[PDB]
Protein: endothiapepsin
Amino acid sequence: STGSATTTPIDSLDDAYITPVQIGTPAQTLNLDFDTGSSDLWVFSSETTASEVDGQTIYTPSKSTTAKLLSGATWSISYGDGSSSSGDVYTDTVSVGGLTVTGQAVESAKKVSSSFTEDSTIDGLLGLAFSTLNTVSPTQQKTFFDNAKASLDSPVFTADLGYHAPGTYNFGFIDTTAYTGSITYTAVSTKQGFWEWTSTGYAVGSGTFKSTSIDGIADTGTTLLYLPATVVSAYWAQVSGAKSSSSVGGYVFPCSATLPSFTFGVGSARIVIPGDYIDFGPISTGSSSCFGGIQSSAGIGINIFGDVALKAAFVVFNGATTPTLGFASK
Ligand SMILES: CSC[C@H](NC(=O)[C@H](Cc1ccccc1)OC(=O)N1CCC(N)CC1)C(=O)N[C@@H](CC1CCCCC1)[C@@H](O)Cn1ccccc1=O
Structure:
């Protein structure tokens, strides 16, 4: 079996991507944020505090004939950006791009952080990391991908994020049409439960490629590119006027500046992020200061290859026994 769902940016900045997902019977369509950095599939529901819902589409378990309460089951999650959500758990039928999975754990939000209520375009999340991260207790649950794995033609899903445009999430197959050249596969470490890999180095603009091992995670749920201080400083050093602002909390540059591209290594291959992708617009409406798409990871504890880097390549998440990450130019 296979599945193909179109993923759409929530705004002109590509801050995040939402993908339509069918939940329940009859189907209740919710726009979820596919997150390979988390392993929980939670959604705004009829249970969420009415005060914390602002325009989001809610999942109403009582309206689904295939929905059953997972007695005693609870969930609580907190993301890097500080966001938070919690509540009870239901099991229902979930379909993505035609690919159906029965008995999927659907975590209905009872409490959501302000950041979420603020986001009207995102109805919930679909974690695509490794199931070891699931927050459901006392019985941990499996992710949607883990539940589909067996039924998939190939235990894989690909990420084809668009720049200022829609992209595609495919399950069970590799569209050899969506990329150029060859796919370079690289080893993945599951130890932390992330799609953790090791980049082989980087280059700023047309500069010399620096061979250096960069351990990071493929995170579709993260907007920007978080790299080590040294790497980030070398990039922004090539942008006249760019600087690290304590007030804004990151590297900003003159909106009139031309951003050099960023090259990251995967094996012997090279993925180039056009400079246009690194521009995240005015820090504030009307401001002439722009937010950089490449920030330091010094405070996270881990480097994150977020949307900024991922959307520059066709990404294959091989959920095989020996998971691997595939990167191809597109
Ligand atoms: C340093 S992880 C900060 C990161 N959240 C972001 O990247 C958000 C995402 C976003 C953007 C726009 C609207 C709504 C949400 O967007 C920004 O933070 N920004 C920075 C400010 C803006 N200038 C650009 C946009 C993050 O927690 N991701 C997690 C996924 C979800 C997606 C939905 C919103 C909450 C976070 C996740 O995979 C990260 N994870 C990875 C490993 C371990 C724990 C962990 O938790």
Observations:
- The chain has two domains: 5-174, 175-330.
